[PDB]
Each structure stands twice: as structure tokens, then as C-alpha cells.
């Protein structure tokens, strides 16, 4: 039998041979549109901080008030002694904001997917999953006894063919990202939801990258498509991206929240979030109502950055959200491009196969409300210099 | 079916009516004051023995101030996963402080104890590996294992005779992993690592310890069960534990050999696909580690309180199920009597929650009490007075 170091080496030297081994960088200043990496100031386009909330004094003061009042830790799972007044306050504020009958907060978007898919799905159920769904959705589904089918990315012709072919006396669940993390495209819920109604299916939307981004005042992708009051639409999304904390929520029908409280394994077995995290998120919800112009500025910045990259000759892959991939083609060129950007004071991560297709390696950039014109123009200047040098633009 | 596939409210009702029939429907209490040995439930001050707050850290000013400093310096959110733009100086500060405290070469912090088990078991295990799992392992270990392609065997609880029988019968060219709670979450007994680890060496196996209830509780200064048994430098012993219980925050850690940390950074799915913890959480936990070094007598007081409380429950005629740690179950037998006993304790000013099947065996329903360093003699005696009154009234003690 192998020992631990022997198994570690076999896995690590595999990744190193594969060109898959990661050496993460340590950020040396707060999560902001300008930050410090390897001792140098950089324009940061790598983070999920869409509304510039992650170091906003308003969230930090509401966090500080809840910290001082309630303490450092909840000290139990929600179902034993870890539900406090402040957890209830945040679920009421979220449901109000989402426009859904109910909201439940869980330990992360990652565990929310396990909890909600696990609670909802039984043996004999059929799941129809978009090809390009977030990894956390796959782990949720693997823990269920449901039949798992995959439809080609955003392909409602294929989805329909599968719904047609796979009837059940149980539940049909159509499972999609709201906004896909890599290409920044929006799930076609305008076609998926009606298809759901034809073949009696429930729609499950993991809106990590749509929450605080799409819809009126950032109420999300489901709100954007107008389906937030539909009891047969279930929404899950992280509180770690636009909302700039940690946690994930489940929102929809009244009855869903009671089922999750009683069945969701991460809710039953993992400690509830502490006062400072809940304080910050109550802050984030109050701040986005006080400053709806933040969402405006996120989209203005996004449109400016995509338009200027198109002018230089770059392909941003039809991205529809602040997720702005810049195509470099092959993995090595994307990684070299990222290295050269950092030399220019711009921090944005190269992504290639297996995370994205062969021939579709990109640098992933996420535009935020807190980026200034000078910051975006510095990124553009760097992309111009690096693009010319690597012969992807002229 | 004539009417089609089920709608969401139909599946919810069907599941909730089932749970209500099975006696599995839960209406959690809402706590109206901080996590302390005395808190407020339903408008009334109560002796709280329901929480995991072993060292009384959850509302300690020292953790709150170190959390405050990190919050002010760094902000409300990390805003990315560790592998992209979510590792900050403070995450590495906490990992270095944890490895130093644990006496392991390395430590890595993950989103929870629950997901830590998925990340570490998932990173380590491949198709053709053999896992030997204790019968009474935590739900989070089961979910970690289910996500792996490893062959899964179960040994009768703490039964090193049966474990050896299985090791003898189930060989692999890959990895043998013996997986156990360090401290069992429900019956509060200690994994026999003094016997498991030597057995692991005989059959060339790695030992995996989920020490959620041992971290900050067993060993010198609460360094944990693996430290208590003296195996903290062993590269073939892996530890995972929550930072949510004794350490009174959120998160989980993985500790052991240098190489383990680099494999988790590259392979652990919760690490790759979930946002890192924010400054307030990391601040509080750096604070917790400084406070237990300033006040290691907290562990002594936790154990004095534990021994007192166990002895007095035995005196009344209650069965605490051979519990060894501050986890002090009181056996009621059936789930309904545990639930009723919990209701009657609340009437007496005492908050402790009943637990029955499926989380514990049928006929082994109990109230879980967790004694802490911050419980006073008067609080424990008030709990005992309540257990006496409720016990006599339900005809379980005489
Ligand atoms: C509490 C506990 C966990 C879960 O830890 P969280 O950080 O609350 O997710 C895992 N394993 C065991 C043994 C536990 O007791
Ligand atoms: C980021 C993300 C998650 C994970 O959310 P965490 O709160 O970071 O665990 C899940 N699903 C999708 C689609 C995401 O983009």
C-alpha cells in the first residue's frame, strides 16, 4: 500500500506534468479594484467584488455593531442552538429584497447546492443539467439518487428532446447556472421556464454571478426574467461575490424553507454564520437600496471595458455580464498573457483547458462598480501592449 | 402519472408530511442573547448546555477585539476563492499559527469542518483505494466518502479486533485509509488512536481523524486528540477539525505533513470552488489561539466542570453512555421521551436539545449536554436540579 507522501507526490507530479499545478498568489492589501500582489500595486480584475462592497466602510460598520453586540461565534448548527435573532433578520431582509416568499441562508453557495439539491431530489426523479454548470452543482447531484441527464450548453432544443424522452411520477428538475462563470453568458430562462411548464418540471437556478448584478437593483437573473414569484422556480446563490461576504441563500416558495430546515445536510450538520458576517450582509442589502447607482456604474464600466477591448481587436466571447473573458486561444498563451499583464500592473487570471475548451483559453476579467476610468484604461493600455507583442491584435 | 411530474409545493408537502409522521420534523429555537452558558430562549434566561462553546470563546472580548482589528484593516469580504484572488496575508497568518499550535508541519483552513472532510477525503482517495470507517463516524465523513470512488468498509464502533479482521481481508496496491471521529459527536467517547495507529502501521494504512470535538478540548492546551496520543508529527496521520466549536468561529482545518497542504490547494473541491473566509472570522480565530495560550487553565476548568456534571448525573441514576469528554449525553431511550424531557427542562430554565433516530440509534435517544469552561457551579447545579425534577416526573430515575 502507498503512504500519504507517496500518494501526494503521485497526484502532485501528475498535475505538474499535466501543466495543471497551481501556485496561488497572496494579496497584501484589501479586496479592492487596486490591491497589492508580490509587493506591487495592481489593477485587480481577478475578484468577484462586483459592487465594491468587500472593503466598504458601511458593511464594515454594520459588521462591527453585530460583532460587538453578539460575539465572534454562533457556537452551533441552526437546528440546535445556532439560530439567533440576527440570522432571522437577514433571512427576512433577503426574502424582501429577492421578492420571494422565503429565503434561507446556508454556509456557502458550494454547500447550498448540496443542501437544496439533496432536500429536493429522490430516487426516480430526473435532473436535466446544463453542460457547463458550476462544479458545486455536480457534487450536490452526486449525493442524490436522482437520474442525471446533461443538456448541451443553453441548448433548449436538446433540453426539450430530453424532457420529452424522460417522464417521471416524481420530480423533473432543470438545473442551470443563472450566469455562467467562465463565458459570462446568461441562462435562457425566457425559453427554459416555458419549456418547464410544458413538461411539468421545476427550474433550479444557481445565480452566484447574477445576484447583485442582473435584474432591477441587482435582484438577480430570475427577477430579470420576471419569475421570482413562481413557486416552481428555486434560486440558490452565494453571498460571497456581489454581496462581498460568505454564505449562500435558497429563495422561493414558503414550503421550500421548511423542507431545507428539516432535510438540508449542511444546514443540519455545519455551524451557522457568525455575527460579523451577518452584520456585513444586512449592511450590503441596506447599502444597495441607498445606492442603486452602484449597479448602474457596474454596467457602465462593463460596457466601456468590453467596447474598448473590441476596438483593440479582442474577442470577449459574447459575454453579457461584467464577466469579461479576453480570448487568447491556447492555454500557454493565455498564461503568458496573464504573466505579461502582471508585469504591467494588471492582475487577471489566465484560464485554459480543462477548465475551458481547448482553443478557448482566456484571461478572465471581472469588472466592478469600484473600478475608475483610469483603472480600466490602465488595464486597456496593458492589454494593448501585451496583445500587440503576442500577435493576437495588430 | 396522469397529472404529470410533481410541482415543488407537492414534493415539499409529501416530504414534510413524511417527516411529521416519522417524528423527524424540527422547529429550532431562536436564541435572543449571545452564545454563553446563560442565554435567552423564548423571552426567558436559561442555562444553556446545547452549544459547542467549550472554552467560552463565542462572546469573549479578546476574540471580539482581535476580530474588530482585522475587520477594520481588511474589510467585510475576501471576494474570491483562495486559488485566484482570495488568499490574503491574514489567511497565511492563521495557517502558520494553527500548524505551530497543532505541532504539525502544515495546516490549511477550509470553508467548514463539514466541507473539510469532502476536500481532504476527495483529494486523498482514488478508485481501488480501501477505506475502513468507524460505524458511528459523523455525517460529514459519510458525504466526503460518497464523493470518492474508494472501496468503503465499516468497522463496528471502536472495535480494533474487527478493524484488524477487515485490514487482513482487504488489501490494495493503492491507499488504505482508516477514518474515525477523534471525539464522537453523539456519545462523546474518544477514538482508541493508541490501538488504531499501531494497527495502521502493521497493515500499511494511513489514519484520518475528524477531531471536531477534540480540538480545543483534549491534549495539552487543547491541541487535540492526535496530540493527546502523541501522533502529531506522524506524516501518515491526517487531522481535520472545525474552527466552529472550541475555537468559536467558522471554518475547518486540515493539518499534517507539508505535502498534504500542497495536494489540498490543488485538489480539494471546497478549496477550489468556494470563497475564502473574511477578516473578522480569521481575526477572531487568531485571537482564540492567543487566548488559549494566555489562559490554558480554561481547559482545566472545562474538565473539572465535566467530571462534576457526569458524577452528579450518575448519582441521580442517569446513564451518560460511557461519554469521556465534555459531551455528556443523558439517555432517555425513545425519541419522544427525549423530546418531552427537553421540553420539561426548558420549563425549568434549562436548554438542552433531544436527539433521536436517525442521528443516533433507535432506543438510544438522548439529550446532548455540552459542559463548557464558562459554566459555573450554580449553573451546573441548576441543570442537575432540573434533570432531577424532570427525571422523577418521567419515571426514569427514582
Ligand atoms: C461539528 C462537526 C463537523 C462539522 O464542522 P462545521 O465546521 O460545523 O461544518 C464535522 N465533523 C464532526 C465530527 C463534527 O463534530
Ligand atoms: C461562486 C459560485 C459558487 C460557490 O459559492 P461559494 O459561496 O463561494 O461557496 C457556487 N455556484 C456558482 C455558480 C458560483 O459561481
Author numbering:
A (entry chain B): 3 to 396
B (entry chain A): -1 to 396
Authors' text:
We report a chemo-biocatalytic cascade for the synthesis of substituted pyrroles, driven by the action of an irreversible, thermostable, pyridoxal 5′-phosphate (PLP)-dependent, C–C bond-forming biocatalyst (ThAOS). The ThAOS catalyzes the Claisen-like condensation between various amino acids and acyl-CoA substrates to generate a range of α-aminoketones. Like other members of the AOS family, ThAOS forms a tight homodimer with the PLP cofactor bound at the interface between the two monomers, typical of type IV PLP-binding enzymes. We next characterized ThAOS thermostability, finding it stable at temperatures of up to 80 °C over 3 h.
The successful application of ThAOS for pyrrole synthesis inspired us to understand the molecular basis for the broad substrate specificity displayed by this enzyme. The final key result was the determination of the 1.6 Å resolution crystal structure of ThAOS with the bound PLP cofactor. This molecular insight paves the way for future engineering of ThAOS to expand its substrate range—an endeavor which will be aided by the inherent and unique thermostability of ThAOS. We predict that Arg366 is involved in similar functions in ThAOS, allowing the biocatalyst to accept the observed broad range of AAs. The acceptance of acyl-CoA substrates ranging from C2–C8 is more difficult to understand since there is a lack of high-resolution structures of bacterial AOS:acyl-CoA complexes. However, the observation that ThAOS can use various acyl-CoAs suggests that the binding site is suitably dynamic to accommodate a broad range of acyl chains. Furthermore, a sequence alignment of ThAOS with 7 other AOS members highlights conserved residues that are potentially involved in substrate binding and catalysis. These will be ideal candidates for future engineering.
